[PDB]
Paper text:
Here, we present structural and functional characterization of the Enc34 ORF6 that allows us to establish its function as a single-stranded DNA-binding protein (SSB) and extend this annotation to other DUF2815 family members. The SSBs are ubiquitous within all kingdoms of life and in DNA viruses, and protect ssDNA intermediates during replication, repair and recombination. In this study, we show that the Enc34 ORF6 is structurally homologous to the gene 2.5 protein from bacteriophage T7, and present a high-resolution structure of ORF6 in complex with ssDNA, which reveals for the first time the structural basis for the ssDNA-binding mechanism of T7-type SSBs.
The complex structure reveals the DNA strand stretching across the entire ligand-binding surface of the OB-fold domain, which is largely positively charged and enclosed by loops L12, L23′3 and L45 that connect strands β1 and β2, β23′ and β3, and β4 and β5, respectively. The interaction thus involves portions of all five strands of the β-barrel and buries a total of 891 Å2 of the solvent-accessible surface of the ORF6ΔC protein. Upon ssDNA binding, the core of the domain remains unchanged, but the cleft-defining loops L12 and L23′3 shift to accommodate the nucleic acid and, as a result, become ordered compared to the structures without bound DNA. The protein-DNA interface reveals an extensive network of interactions that involves both stacking of aromatic side chains with DNA bases and a number of hydrogen bonds and electrostatic interactions between the protein and the DNA. The three 5′-terminal bases (T1-T3) form a slightly slanted stack, which at the 3′ end is topped by the indole ring of Trp150. The T4 base stacks with the side chain of Tyr156, resulting in a prominent twist in the DNA backbone which causes the base to face away from the protein. Following the T4-T6 stack, the bases T7 and T8 are buried in-between loops L12 and L23′3, causing another bend in the sugar-phosphate backbone.
Residue numbers in the entry: 1 to 177
Write the structure that this text describes.
Amino acid sequence: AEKLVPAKKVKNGVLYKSGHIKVSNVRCSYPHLDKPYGGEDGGEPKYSITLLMPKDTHGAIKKIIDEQIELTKKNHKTGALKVAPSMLFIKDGDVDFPDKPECEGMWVISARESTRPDVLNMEREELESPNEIAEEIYGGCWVSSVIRPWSQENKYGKRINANLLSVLKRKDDEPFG
DNA sequence: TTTTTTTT
Ligand code: NA
């Protein structure tokens, strides 16, 4: 549920007082919302999505994400955390994925969660069956998503990752396949 | 309220 209290609203996004961030009107790729992904090779399976944020239209919400990344580093429970820019949930499509046409001119956000996120159709109805979830949110559609940064400091390294809380269908478009 | 991701 969006039972959150806005702190700051910008074009294509909202920062909430709880530290959650809504990233609005972004293109979806590689959804794993019907069934969790990963944990073939040691890790535990998680639901996930990639969000493609156009650089020309989403600069304000990008700035909020950066600010919140810094805040998350500073507030890490064991003390302020140093994290490399390659170890964040946000990547630069033009640098990191130059051979992927769908990433051209995009910020690329990866968000994951062990608990299945809320999945809403355009009528804001919450979906429950894996098949209906897979049909609704297909790679290439546009969504709005609630995420929240978190700080990782463990045996595998130091990262700022993003919890995936909700995915709302916004627009249909050509599927990536 | 919690915790490795990764392009896949
Ligand atoms: Na459910």
